[PDB]
A paper describes a structure:
Deubiquitinating enzymes (DUBs) play fundamental roles in ubiquitin signaling through their ability to remove ubiquitin from target proteins and disassemble polyubiquitin chains 1. The yeast SAGA complex is a transcriptional coactivator that is involved in transcription of all RNA polymerase II genes 22, 23. Among the SAGA activities are the removal of monoubiquitin from histone H2B, which promotes transcription initiation and elongation. The deubiquitinating activity of SAGA resides in a four‐protein complex known as the DUB module, which comprises the USP family catalytic subunit, Ubp8, as well as Sgf11, Sus1, and the N‐terminal ~100 residues of Sgf73 25, 26.
In order to measure the affinity of the DUB module for other substrates using binding assays, we expressed and purified catalytically inactive versions of the DUB module containing Ubp8 with its active site cysteine, C146, substituted with either serine (C146S) or alanine (C146A). To determine the structural basis for the marked increase in affinity for free ubiquitin when the active site cysteine is substituted with alanine, we solved the crystal structure of the SAGA DUB module containing Ubp8C146A bound to free ubiquitin at a resolution of 2.1 Å. The overall fold and contacts with ubiquitin are virtually identical to those found in the structure of the wild‐type enzyme bound to ubiquitin aldehyde, superimposing all atoms with an RMSD of 0.58 Å 27. The active site of the C146A mutant is virtually identical to that in the wild‐type apoenzyme 29, with no significant reordering of residues 29. In the Ubp8C146A complex with free ubiquitin, the negatively charged carboxylate of the ubiquitin C‐terminal Gly76 forms two hydrogen bonds with backbone amides from Ubp8 residues Thr145 and Ala146, as well as with active site residues, Asn141 and His427. Importantly, the observed position of the ubiquitin C‐terminus would not be compatible with the presence of the wild‐type active site residue, Cys146, since the sulfhydryl group would clash with the C‐terminal residue of ubiquitin, Gly76. The multiple hydrogen bonding interactions observed between the C‐terminal carboxylate of ubiquitin and Ubp8 can therefore only occur when the active Cys146 is replaced with the smaller alanine side chain, thus explaining the higher affinity of DUB module‐Ubp8C146A for free ubiquitin as compared to the wild‐type enzyme. The alanine substitution alleviates steric hindrance by the active site cysteine sulfhydryl, allowing the C‐terminal carboxylate of ubiquitin to form additional hydrogen bonds in the enzyme active site and thus accounting for the high affinity of the mutant enzyme for free ubiquitin. The structure of the SAGA DUB module bound to free ubiquitin reveals the structural basis for the 30‐fold higher affinity of Ubp8C146A for ubiquitin.
Author numbering:
A (entry chain A): 2 to 199, 209 to 260, 270 to 394, 405 to 471
B (entry chain D): 1 to 76
C (entry chain E): 4 to 21, 26 to 95
D (entry chain C): 7 to 65, 67 to 94
E (entry chain B): 5 to 95
Write the structure that this text describes.
Amino acid sequence: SICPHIQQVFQNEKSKDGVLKTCNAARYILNHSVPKEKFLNTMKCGTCHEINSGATFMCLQCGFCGCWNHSHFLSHSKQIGHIFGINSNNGLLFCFKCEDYIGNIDLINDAILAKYWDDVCTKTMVPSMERRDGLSGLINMGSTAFMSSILQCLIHNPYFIRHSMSQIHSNNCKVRSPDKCFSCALDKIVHELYGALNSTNRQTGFIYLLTCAWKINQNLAGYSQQDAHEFWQFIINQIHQSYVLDLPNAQCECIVHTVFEGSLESSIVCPGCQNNSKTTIDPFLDLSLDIKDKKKLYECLDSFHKKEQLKDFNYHCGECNSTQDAIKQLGIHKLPSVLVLQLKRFEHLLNGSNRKLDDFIEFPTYLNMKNYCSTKVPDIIYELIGIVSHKGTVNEGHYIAFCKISGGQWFKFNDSMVSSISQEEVLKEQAYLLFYTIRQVN
Amino acid sequence: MQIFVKTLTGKTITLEVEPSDTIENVKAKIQDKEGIPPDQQRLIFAGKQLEDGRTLSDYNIQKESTLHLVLRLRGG
Amino acid sequence: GDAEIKGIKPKVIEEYSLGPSNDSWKSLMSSAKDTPLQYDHMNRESLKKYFNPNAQLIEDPLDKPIQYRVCEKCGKPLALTAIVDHLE
Amino acid sequence: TIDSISNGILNNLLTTLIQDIVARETTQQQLLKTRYPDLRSYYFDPNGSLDINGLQKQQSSQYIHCENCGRDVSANRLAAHLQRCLS
Amino acid sequence: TAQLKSQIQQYLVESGNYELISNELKARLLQEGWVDKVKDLTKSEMNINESTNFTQILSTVEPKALEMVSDSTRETVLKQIREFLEEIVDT
Ligand SMILES: [Zn+2]
Ligand SMILES: [Zn+2]
Ligand SMILES: [Zn+2]
Ligand SMILES: [Zn+2]
Ligand SMILES: [Zn+2]
Ligand SMILES: [Zn+2]
Ligand SMILES: [Zn+2]
Ligand SMILES: [Zn+2]
């Protein structure tokens, strides 16, 4: 089941070290080449001179690059016997004798560890089958759906997973323990869902979290029904506070403040002379959008970004001296890596009650933020990765989470039930919170 | 000092305040304009809800800052 | 659209300096070492303008499953870059 | 032709991109099949009642051993238990 | 000749217009759902083929992926390309 050509090369330690060195070199070049150089020098066939004639492969043995579409690397490997090439779009190693990629050798996939590999193999193992995607249910402990729904979006967030598995918190944590430390409790959940702590399995970390949460805020600890947005904001604030607590020497550099933080530009404009000061800059960790009388998410972003003339604001223009009602606009000044949206699914009525807004709002699988940034603006596309939905009324209900992982697959998280679900069915849910991750900036 | 609240419909309202005003006082001004009882209001600035027993200056809210008003969608 | 191509404007062949190649991709190392981390679909100038300068970025974070190994002693899931340090 | 060459350029971009996506998906599943001789896909249930293992909802009579008082507690009352037990 | 096509590609890269074509194509494919559809197709072809062999899988995915490109994306990108080509070829 492994390419025998590469295994044959790997019999000799030096030859093996040579392959890994060239693979490391090719991949370093692919991540550190400006776009023009990358096209001209990694995607241009040495024989037909076309750019992107299908995949272009960089030879392991000489400096030649050859294309897929005209069989030009295949010719190189028959003419000269250089049978291994690296695909310049993704760094993957192809065997031209097998006519297949070599994707199932851990050392090649993890080549940046080549020099440590002896120690890596013996002390660490590959994930176990059922744990490899961290999919696991969190039992309802009373009214914990507002917790678990958010927890599932967090442990499927690629930025939070990388952070946790990189041991950044663990390495620096002063308080040391999942009983007292809220961050350590989060890390124990990841430990349990993707690793081994070594029916009601895999609930230990979630119990630890319930305990930490009780010590800080009993209302958000799972006894009574609460808001999922409020719990979301509670968790990230605890992550940030842990980081401040752990610094030797107390714009923030913690994981929350480098991933979820953007800023809004609020401008107040003279309708007299178009004077554009003073503009105010407010940070945000999420955007809360009004939805009344709307049917699409873009229409809700339009509303948030729409000019308002302020009728209760006392304005005096410093340029023209006008006292007309000023024009107010919110624009996005800085975008975050992960855009979190809360739909304001609730209204207050002048008869002294509140009611949920149950309207379906259409949300797209990829979101362009270009038309919402203040101040040409390029395409800025985020991919939808998580949805928290609420069923019930304003005062009582239940939360479910939907999250997206590699390979296009969505899962539905409803307390202890984790289920497979099609993208099509996810797009029909009543979204309360939406989690979008940056994909493309032109 | 004048600050703004973006309310449940996205309509912005203006409040006259001082940095030493308590959050509970701010909520009572919003109640006067919107009719929403203070204990049902969540006021968000910079990713934090503003807590009763603290002041606008505790959160560095300055002139022409915008607060975002939400309610709670309870669930469990 | 069905219009035939006579040749490239000779004005253009001049401005741009337009057998098999002798280029080597291996010769790219020195300039690659001088170049900050690039993203294929995240324009660097746009990043500085619309994103925070300390922003964490993962290009295409769902292209593959999270890459990790599990510690034999403690069963902790470890990102590849954290393995050697964890091993004390 | 203008259309000739335009189509050729687009077909270079399209096939490049297809070949990139397909390589990434096939290496990934190659690794999974090698690494797990026993690999089965997550159960998908078009009736929407079974989980990723093909099991039904467990549903009550579930308990958790409380580490704080050493006593078993009904799972659905754990948060209410901890309110009293933690103080 | 074949030398013509490569010279033109080289022009489009040096002028920066190649990155513009390539980004715009990618943006539109992503937004119309085509990338996710190709991933779903590849998963299904692997299942049927009972093998992850790239040559076999690509020979069945590739023609269907090309057909899945919306007419909207295909014409918009062809236009953007055509406009770039008119600046540098003689008609
Ligand atoms: Zn082989
Ligand atoms: Zn070629
Ligand atoms: Zn070679
Ligand atoms: Zn800790
Ligand atoms: Zn922080
Ligand atoms: Zn004026
Ligand atoms: Zn360990
Ligand atoms: Zn107890």
